[PDB]
Design a protein around this ligand. Structure first.
Ligand SMILES: Nc1ncnc2c1ncn2[C@@H]1O[C@H](COP(=O)(O)OP(=O)(O)OP(=O)(O)O)[C@@H](O)[C@H]1O
Ligand SMILES: [Mn+2]
Length: 501
């Protein structure tokens, strides 16, 4: 769905145009060879040229496959990796691992197969690439090509960069549309924030807060921010598109009054991962409700509606009675200094409501006032049914602990405490986070489930494209493969040769 002249829009600039990028970018290994997708691919492509570095890339790949290998096939994958990479005579043999650490891997294999077997060897392969191989790549043509990709990334994002279609949406500040990137054709979701409604409502702080939080988090289970630009009539937020309806619709309208045990476990697992990724940024969500868990095209879920979120400084608490009736934790209802605990309360509400088919403190039939719901949350102990297994009951009443100090996941450990819970005894999060596991429900594709002031913050908001989502977009749409073309037989293409502009 790309424009007819898309190859001109994303045309590489001459390497001479990237001299100010070269002098400011930080030469960090993890950022330029891993975190950034296009940067990662280029370093890998650099290691593919030199033959001595080829095996190290093949090795790390086979390690990634082992971490997600089914628990049973771990023993088989362990011997395959050994006989190929960790045997001196073999052709592709990583040497910088050391003769001692390979003998250690042999004992680990003999004492049962653990998913973290080669974790020690992988960290040894990286520590080697961080040195000479990385600095050679920094001088190689591939890094020059990376600079050209950064030059495109940081280009101005305006209205003419997209192709607004029409879809559902009408939030507190505006509406939502289906914007498509013209040069790449990738579908997105545009969240228009009208200009006038923000100034009179003193929303500049909550809109900028929502934008910064949306870009500062990159998780497969939370709506990501790809672009943030301004137009002559509103402020746009380009977010991930979710065409599989929301979770509230599927709990009640779709399926039976609820979900099955196992089905709810899957959605609970990905929500738990989404919260973990937010909590690595010490950012609390506080708005965990069924209709804010959207499904994508393949059946997976993402947490959306991060406007009610806030970033908590490490080692500090925040106060605020905000949220939705029935989904507010007692410490929030009482308006106390809380941290991340309200999100694990809401998680209990989500697990309960998916398995039973109603809120833990508000029946689906009950016409109760907003005060009685708050009373149950603070005083009443929820009851369970034969729909909950013994483990399902546990994780709920542990996540629904009135005292936030003893609530599951609200300890020093964090989300790791919840993944161990016997309720997730059969969930392989190593495989869930890699998309290896299949969702339980697949949405059918065809289914349709002024003034001079304030100009200061308008530029603080309209920051342009986001780095990692933009590089992913180029890879998914296959713009990277088609454009990332060098000269024949390892030769500098015209755009990477300085002798002729
Ligand atoms: N990723 C998406 N793809 C397509 N449509 C979406 C997507 N995300 C949200 N929408 C739709 O656009 C609407 C935008 O409304 P918005 O989420 O901003 O506020 P709200 O739903 O009214 O609740 P709140 O006040 O807590 O934000 C959503 O209600 C939803 O219907
Ligand atoms: Mn919303």
């Amino acid at each position: 769905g790309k424009s007819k002249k898309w190859k001109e829009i994303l045309k590489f600039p001459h390497i001479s145009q990237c001299e100010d990028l070269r002098r400011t970018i930080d030469r960090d290994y993890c950022s330029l060879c891993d975190k950034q997708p296009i940067g990662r691919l280029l370093f890998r492509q650099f290691c593919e040229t030199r033959p001595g570095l080829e095996c190290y890339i093949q090795f790390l790949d086979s390690v990634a496959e082992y971490e997600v290998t089914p628990d049973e096939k771990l023993g088989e994958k362990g011997k395959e990796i050994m006989t190929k990479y960790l045997t001196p005579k073999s052709p592709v043999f990583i040497a910088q691992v050391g003769q001692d650490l390979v003998s250690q891997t042999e004992e680990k294999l003999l004492q049962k197969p653990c998913k973290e077997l080669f974790s020690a060897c992988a960290q040894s392969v990286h520590e080697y690439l961080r040195g000479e191989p990385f600095h050679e790549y920094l001088d190689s043509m591939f890094f020059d090509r990376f600079l050209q990709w950064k030059w495109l990334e940081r280009q101005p994002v305006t209205k003419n960069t997209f192709r607004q279609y029409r879809v559902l949406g009408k939030g507190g500040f505006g509406e939502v549309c289906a914007c498509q990137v013209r040069a790449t054709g990738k579908m997105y979701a545009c969240k228009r924030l009208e200009k006038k409604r923000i100034k009179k409502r003193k929303g500049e702080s909550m809109a900028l807060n929502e934008k910064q939080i949306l870009e500062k988090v990159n998780s497969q289970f939370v709506v990501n921010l790809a672009y943030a630009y301004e137009t002559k009539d509103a402020l746009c937020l380009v977010l991930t598109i979710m065409n599989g309806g929301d979770l509230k619709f599927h709990i009640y309208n779709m399926g039976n009054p609820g979900f099955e045990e196992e089905r709810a476990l899957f959605y609970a697992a990905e929500i738990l991962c989404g919260l973990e990724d937010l909590h690595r940024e010490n950012t609390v969500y506080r708005n965990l409700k069924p209709e804010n868990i959207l499904l994508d095209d393949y059946g997976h879920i993402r947490i959306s509606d991060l406007g009610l979120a806030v970033k908590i400084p490490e080692g500090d608490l925040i106060r605020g009675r905000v949220g939705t009736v029935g989904y507010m934790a007692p410490e929030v209802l009482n308006n106390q200094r809380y941290g991340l605990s309200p999100d694990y309360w809401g998680l209990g509400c989500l697990i309960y409501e998916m398995i039973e088919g109603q809120s833990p403190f508000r029946g689906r039939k009950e016409k109760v006032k907003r005060e009685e719901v708050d009373r149950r949350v603070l005083e009443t102990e929820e009851v369970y049914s034969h729909k909950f297994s013994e483990e399902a009951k546990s994780i709920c009443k542990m996540l629904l602990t009135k005292d936030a100090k003893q609530r599951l996941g609200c300890q020093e450990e964090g989300a790791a405490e919840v993944k161990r819970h016997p309720f997730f005894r059969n969930m392989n999060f190593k495989r869930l986070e890699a998309g290896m596991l299949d969702p339980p429900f697949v949405p059918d594709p065809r289914a349709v489930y002024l003034d001079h002031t304030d100009d200061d913050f308008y530029s603080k908001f309209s920051t342009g494209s986001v780095s990692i989502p933009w590089q992913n977009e180029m890879i998914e749409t296959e713009c990277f493969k088609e454009l990332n073309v060098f000269g024949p037989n390892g030769t500098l293409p015209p755009d990477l040769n300085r002798n002729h502009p």
